[PDB]
Amino acid sequence: HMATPHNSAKVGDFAETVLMCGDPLRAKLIADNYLENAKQVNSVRGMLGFTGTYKGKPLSVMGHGMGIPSISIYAEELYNVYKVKTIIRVGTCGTVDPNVHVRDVCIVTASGTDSNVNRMRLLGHDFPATANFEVVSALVESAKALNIPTQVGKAYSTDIFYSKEQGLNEALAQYHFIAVEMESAGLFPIADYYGARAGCICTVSDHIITHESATPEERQTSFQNMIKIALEATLKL
């Protein structure tokens, strides 16, 4: 009998800090290239998860799939069953902000959404999906120590990758949303429920307004910046 319907890991197999990204093959890339002593601890549904050490400190990395419902399953389980204390989401994003550019690293303070999941948690009201301040601060300070500039601010998590919605990008730009992605607004309230911590850091692959797009080489540079910031932050958490 598995510890959860979606994870074959035993309790204790996950470290107290987990980095998560949507693509399980990127979780494997992170484990292979940045973790020592790495072991695979889950392969249910292909959602690869790993546990090793980064500069001596135990750390896990696991895929979360695409969209709020998917990350909600995995994060709820990590906090509840596996007793994880901190999850940092790592990924790519689009941007609409006029002063944010392709290749920028975005540290998320809070995330809006077009999902109903947070209204359902707070009697239909506005519940800001808010990153933990110690996690945000650790990402900011790590980036500074690594000499990597960052953008710090709001994300927007959508349920629909293939948006047909007119006027959305313009409103997001007006209020200086810096990242558009699909998961962070589902993660932060789950961390709240469990008295635990979460954050998110993303790299800008596309400017939704100007249509600038990162080259493969720029995506490599940005990814290497982002993952080093996240990894060094875990030593602080």
Q: Name which of residues 94 to 153 contact a copy of itself (CB under 8 A).
A: 109-131, 133, 136-137, 140, 152-153
What Cα–Cα distance (Å) separates residue 213 from each residue in 22, 82, 93, 152? Answer: 20, 38, 11, 21
Q: Which is nearer to a copy of itself, 54 or 117 (CB)?
A: 117
Near a copy of itself by CB under 8 A: residue from 149, 167, 211, 217:
167
* Residues in 27-66 at the binding interface with a copy of itself, rule: CB under 8 A: 44-48, 63, 65-66
CB 59, min distance to a copy of itself, A: 21
Q: Would you tell me how many other CB atoms lie within 10 Å of the CB of residue 98? A: 12
124 Cβ partners below 8 Å, 6+ apart? Answer: none
What Cα–Cα distance (Å) separates residue 170 from each residue in 98, 113, 184, 206? Answer: 10, 15, 21, 15
Near a copy of itself by CB under 8 A: residue from 33, 37, 160, 220:
160
155, containing H or E segment = strand 151-157
Q: Which is nearer to a copy of itself, 27 or 226 (CB)?
A: 27
CB 23, min distance to a copy of itself, A: 5
Q: Which is nearer to a copy of itself, 54 or 233 (CB)?
A: 233
Counting beta carbons within 10 angstroms of the beta carbon of residue 99, is it exposed (0 to 12), middle (13 to 18) or buried (19 or more)?
Answer: exposed
Nearest-angstrom CA–CA distance, 49 and 201: 19
Q: Which residues are catalytic?
A: 206
* Residues in 206-235 at the binding interface with a copy of itself, rule: CB under 8 A: none
Residues contributing to the annotated binding site for adenosine: 6, 89, 182-183, 206
